[PDB]
């Protein structure tokens, strides 16, 4: 029903700048209260700022002189701008409309932002071939491995999202090198393993790198 398309997110080095934004599918951003909230793993969640329907502004003391909010009526798009972050600010920021006494009614899906002087790195993907043994049954598990990238997260998809059931994915994990690593697995019926070959589609959006790898039984008795 009611949807808000988000944009922005990505890596920035300290001392830099970035402009974030999100848009409205149907709702009038110009005529309702709008606010940002930033959510960080292991640290919690916080309230950032807001614009009142009269255009007035109001912030949280933690980002004064460093954050600013506004709203462009020409494109019905809320905007957000950044000055001189801190490592603590590492978090996922969200756009959401609230009304009156601050029920945060409808939400966007959120977009991560990462700060570091470390540069971007493309991911590497290693597919996994199912064993001959797992084909002895109704269903079998097919998966792949993605690692040696920076930064998190990495979106994954199998057969361009055509399938829906049996897909399990793992959260990313820090390498001692500073990179991350993750994995995925999809469950499928046994009959088409020798007939249908399933291909995983990977998205490392912050580097905007895509890698596509196949999964085939091949032969493991060796």
């Amino acid at each position: 029903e009611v949807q808000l398309v988000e944009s922005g997110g990505g890596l920035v080095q300290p001392g830099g700048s970035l402009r974030l934004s999100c848009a409205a599918s149907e709702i009038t951003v110009s005529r309702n209260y709008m606010s940002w909230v930033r959510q960080a793993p292991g640290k919690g969640l916080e309230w950032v700022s807001v614009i009142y329907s009269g255009g007035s502004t109001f912030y949280a003391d933690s980002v004064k002189g460093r954050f600013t909010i506004s709203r462009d009526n020409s494109r019905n798009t809320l905007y957000l701008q950044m000055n001189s972050l801190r490592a603590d600010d590492t978090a996922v920021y969200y756009c959401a409309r609230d009304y009156g006494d601050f029920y945060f009614d409808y939400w966007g899906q959120g977009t991560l932002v990462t700060v570091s002087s470390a540069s971007t790195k493309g991911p590497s993907v290693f597919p996994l071939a199912p064993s001959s043994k797992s084909t002895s049954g109704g269903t079998a598990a097919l998966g792949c491995l993605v690692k040696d990238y920076f930064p998190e997260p990495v979106t994954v998809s199998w057969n361009s999202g055509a399938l829906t059931s049996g897909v399990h994915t793992f959260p990313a994990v820090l390498q001692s090198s500073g990179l991350y690593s993750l994995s995925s697995v999809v469950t499928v019926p046994s009959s088409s393993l020798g007939t249908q070959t399933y291909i995983c589609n990977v998205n490392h959006k912050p580097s905007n790198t895509k890698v596509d790898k196949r999964v085939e039984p091949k032969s493991c008795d060796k």
Binding site: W47, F58, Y94, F104, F126, L145, F170, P171, V185, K222
Partner: protein
């Protein structure tokens, strides 16, 4: 600012029962509190406001209450999808804030995992680094136990585990651990084993393979 406190730090109830959640604050709110739900990888959803004003899209199973810095939410006839973290939101002043959060878990039954091993692939060795992963999927509870044995020696310090999240439909966990090796250590060592203990298993299960299997 004003701080909120949530109890319990963890709540786990079985389906069909009635769960209860209570929140406390340093200074009163005068019945302006609110509850939000957020499943993992999803956006938060509004549930109930003030003492008892439930949201539009929420079923009657949800009900809260309270006044004077002590506030309680109770949910009847728990259903599997209801697993999530929950959040109370403050109204007393500017700035706003909201509490640490509460995670609720369902208990249905105990079931054994499925254990698999996967050898390092050719691209890994070409890169000069090899790694070994063992996968434990579809088990209950979260607290599964797994060990790695290298040439009959316990190499407890060179492996890293990874945890999934609760599948709502099935109510089972899954676990992955990775053994990381250097090329020379990989070639020098030959026999690789993993030992797993789980409550859903009648007996501990051990899986192993030889490097010579390629």
């Amino acid at each position: 600012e004003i701080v909120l406190t949530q109890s319990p730090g963890t709540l786990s109830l079985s389906p069909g029962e009635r769960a209860t959640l209570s929140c406390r604050a340093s200074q009163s709110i005068s019945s302006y509190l609110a509850w939000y739900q957020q499943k993992p990888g999803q956006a938060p959803r509004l549930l109930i406001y003030g003492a008892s004003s439930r949201a539009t899209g929420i079923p009657d199973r949800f009900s809260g209450s309270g006044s004077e810095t002590d506030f309680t939410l109770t949910i009847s006839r728990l259903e599997p999808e209801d697993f999530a973290v929950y959040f109370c939101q403050q109204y007393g002043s500017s700035p706003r804030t909201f509490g640490q959060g509460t995670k609720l878990e369902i208990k249905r039954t105990v079931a054994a995992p499925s254990v698999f091993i996967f050898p390092p692939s050719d691209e890994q060795l070409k890169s000069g680094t090899a790694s070994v992963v063992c996968l434990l999927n579809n088990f209950y509870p979260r607290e599964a136990k797994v060990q790695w044995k290298v040439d009959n020696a316990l190499q407890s310090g060179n492996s890293q585990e990874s945890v999934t999240e609760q599948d709502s439909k099935d109510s089972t966990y899954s676990l992955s651990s990775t053994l990381t090796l250097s090329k020379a250590d990989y070639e020098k060592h030959k026999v690789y084993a993993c030992e797993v203990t789980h409550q859903g298993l009648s007996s501990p299960v051990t899986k192993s393979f030889n490097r010579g299997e390629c």
